[PDB]
Design an enzyme around this catalytic site. Structure first.
Site, PDB file in Angstrom:
ATOM      1  CE  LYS A  22      33.871 -12.081 -36.803  1.00  0.00           C
ATOM      2  NZ  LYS A  22      33.938 -11.201 -38.000  1.00  0.00           N
ATOM      3  CG  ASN A  23      37.798 -10.527 -34.108  1.00  0.00           C
ATOM      4  OD1 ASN A  23      37.279 -11.163 -35.024  1.00  0.00           O
ATOM      5  ND2 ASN A  23      37.947  -9.208 -34.141  1.00  0.00           N
ATOM      6  NE  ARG A  93      40.335 -12.992 -46.287  1.00  0.00           N
ATOM      7  CZ  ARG A  93      41.599 -13.282 -46.577  1.00  0.00           C
ATOM      8  NH1 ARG A  93      42.375 -13.903 -45.690  1.00  0.00           N
ATOM      9  NH2 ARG A  93      42.083 -12.963 -47.769  1.00  0.00           N
ATOM     10  CB  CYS A 117      38.546 -10.031 -48.216  1.00  0.00           C
ATOM     11  SG  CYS A 117      37.709  -9.531 -46.708  1.00  0.00           S
ATOM     12  NE  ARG A 122      45.182 -10.680 -41.374  1.00  0.00           N
ATOM     13  CZ  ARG A 122      45.385 -11.705 -40.550  1.00  0.00           C
ATOM     14  NH1 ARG A 122      45.577 -12.937 -41.010  1.00  0.00           N
ATOM     15  NH2 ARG A 122      45.376 -11.483 -39.246  1.00  0.00           N
ATOM     16  CB  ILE A 124      46.990 -18.020 -45.189  1.00  0.00           C
ATOM     17  CG1 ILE A 124      47.243 -18.811 -46.470  1.00  0.00           C
ATOM     18  CG2 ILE A 124      45.512 -17.644 -45.090  1.00  0.00           C
ATOM     19  CD1 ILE A 124      46.507 -20.117 -46.489  1.00  0.00           C
ATOM     20  CG  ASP A 125      51.712 -15.252 -48.239  1.00  0.00           C
ATOM     21  OD1 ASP A 125      52.344 -14.456 -48.968  1.00  0.00           O
ATOM     22  OD2 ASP A 125      50.651 -15.802 -48.616  1.00  0.00           O
ATOM     23  CD  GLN A 126      54.313 -13.565 -42.134  1.00  0.00           C
ATOM     24  OE1 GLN A 126      54.909 -13.991 -41.142  1.00  0.00           O
ATOM     25  NE2 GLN A 126      54.943 -13.017 -43.169  1.00  0.00           N
ATOM     26  CG  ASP A 306      38.794  -5.532 -36.018  1.00  0.00           C
ATOM     27  OD1 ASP A 306      38.815  -6.588 -35.351  1.00  0.00           O
ATOM     28  OD2 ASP A 306      39.226  -5.473 -37.194  1.00  0.00           O
ATOM     29  CB  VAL A 328      46.308  -3.468 -39.821  1.00  0.00           C
ATOM     30  CG1 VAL A 328      46.132  -4.982 -39.786  1.00  0.00           C
ATOM     31  CG2 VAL A 328      47.001  -2.995 -38.557  1.00  0.00           C
ATOM     32  NE  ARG A 398      31.454 -11.661 -41.741  1.00  0.00           N
ATOM     33  CZ  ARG A 398      32.284 -12.686 -41.900  1.00  0.00           C
ATOM     34  NH1 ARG A 398      31.850 -13.852 -42.373  1.00  0.00           N
ATOM     35  NH2 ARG A 398      33.562 -12.541 -41.578  1.00  0.00           N
TER      36      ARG A 398
END
Length: 419
Positions: A22-23, A93, A117, A122, A124-126, A306, A328, A398
């Site tokens: 998936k990822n 997301r 979430c 999580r 998105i700054d980075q 995960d 994390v 998902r």
């Protein structure tokens, strides 16, 4: 509502075949937007709800996407659009993953900022930090983050404060078409990153260092359509490793890649589980008495976040105190309550959960808080007295294809009702 009903204390014995990751497929599909000619042919693509969502996003961006027999044919030869609306970003997301590619193709992107979430914030700054470094100007308006580049993307020297998987995917993807060479330091080393890299190079990019903490991308004029096969889903495979160990069975995960499961294997071995790295995939034999171990989730090659919730179900059957410390995603413990419904003895303190086994789990009607928790609750039900009933299956769908069918093929007393 549709739900899964689990029961018995049956040992799971048999073979199972994992789907494509998936990822890995999500960002790969997103990367397809980079191919200005002709068509990408992605193989081993799982029929996940997120795959359907990402495909629609691409169509919304004016790309043709045909998904059939586990294959997604993408054509991004016409000029693309720039906006990825909020309806998709709230549902999934990972839709932000189209930002890098779009930014690389048109010089600008407009992505709706993500909503709250359950797994945890999580940001998105980075991702933005990276684009700003490549010459992108970022502003926010009407819930959207707008990014437009002056002239064109420049290759830049970028440092991630933490090895963000999402940031690495976007920044790495965007860099493929930037002018000059981009040096991404402290990058995500996850196996999915390596497969995304192999895909970018397949399309005609020059990505080096994927798998290490320093990825070097030397920009090219344009990328082309390629034929790529997505790697197996190590997390899905992991979930099945837990099924074998939790019920004390013998499961052969035919297509599991040992190389992408070392952290998991090492930990299950500390608990007394036996793991054979066969010629094909991996075989897991579970013992009658599991030993308690501590788990600390961290960026790869550390133990994967995960698998956190899944391991929690496993540790509840372990002889002794066990804790999982999440470094994390905090707070990724919204599923703790559901385990308590099932008579679990769990304590949430800071970024850790403390459990003592062996518990006597009692089946109850529980709701999947999120993707991985859904698999965990189901796993918990395989060893809990009475009938466990998991709702909110839209989360399970998902990331898991025919999960109840695979568990049934292994001898589990499982079913999917209101189906």
């Amino acid at each position: 509502m549709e739900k899964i009903i689990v029961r018995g204390g049956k040992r799971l014995n048999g073979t199972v075949r994992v789907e494509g990751a998936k990822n890995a497929v999500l960002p790969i599909i997103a990367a397809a937007l980079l191919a200005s000619d002709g068509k990408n042919v992605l193989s081993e693509v799982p029929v996940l709800s997120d795959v359907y969502t990402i495909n629609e996003v691409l169509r919304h961006l004016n790309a043709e996407v045909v998904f059939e027999n586990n294959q997604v044919t993408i054509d991004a030869s016409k000029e693309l659009n720039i906006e990825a609306p909020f309806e998709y970003v709230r549902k999934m997301r990972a839709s932000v993953q189209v930002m890098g590619p779009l930014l690389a193709r048109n010089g600008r992107a407009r992505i709706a900022l993500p909503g709250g979430c359950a797994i945890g914030s999580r940001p998105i700054d980075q991702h933005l930090k990276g684009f700003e470094a490549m010459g992108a100007k970022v502003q926010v308006g009407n819930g959207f983050v707008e990014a437009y580049v002056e002239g064109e993307l420049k290759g830049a020297k970028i440092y991630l404060d933490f090895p963000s998987v999402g940031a690495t995917e976007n920044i790495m993807s965007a860099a493929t078409l930037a002018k000059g060479t981009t040096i991404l330091e402290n990058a995500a080393k996850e196996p999915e990153i390596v497969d995304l890299a192999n895909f970018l190079n397949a399309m005609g990019a020059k990505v080096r260092g994927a798998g290490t903490g320093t990825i070097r991308i030397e920009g090219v004029d344009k990328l082309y359509g390629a034929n790529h096969s997505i790697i197996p889903d190590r997390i899905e495979a992991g979930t099945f490793m837990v099924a074998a160990a939790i019920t004390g069975g013998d499961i052969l995960i035919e297509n599991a890649v040992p190389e992408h499961l070392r952290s998991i294997t090492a930990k299950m071995e500390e608990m007394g589980v036996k793991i054979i790295e066969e010629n094909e995939g991996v075989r897991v034999i579970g013992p009658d008495k599991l030993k308690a171990v501590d788990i600390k989730t961290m960026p790869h090659p550390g133990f994967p976040t995960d698998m956190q919730s899944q391991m929690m179900a496993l540790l509840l059957q372990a002889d002794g105190t066990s804790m999982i410390t999440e470094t994390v995603f905090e707070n990724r413990f919204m599923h703790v309550e559901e385990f308590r419904r099932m008579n679990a003895d769990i304590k949430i303190e800071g970024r850790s959960v403390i459990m003592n086994g062996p518990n006597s789990l009692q089946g109850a009607e529980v709701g999947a808080t999120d993707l991985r928790a859904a698999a965990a609750l189901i796993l918990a039900g395989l060893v809990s007295e009475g009938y466990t009933r998991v709702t909110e299956l839209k989360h399970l769908d998902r990331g898991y294809v025919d999960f109840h069918k695979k568990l049934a093929a292994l001898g589990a007393t499982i079913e999917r009702v209101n189906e």
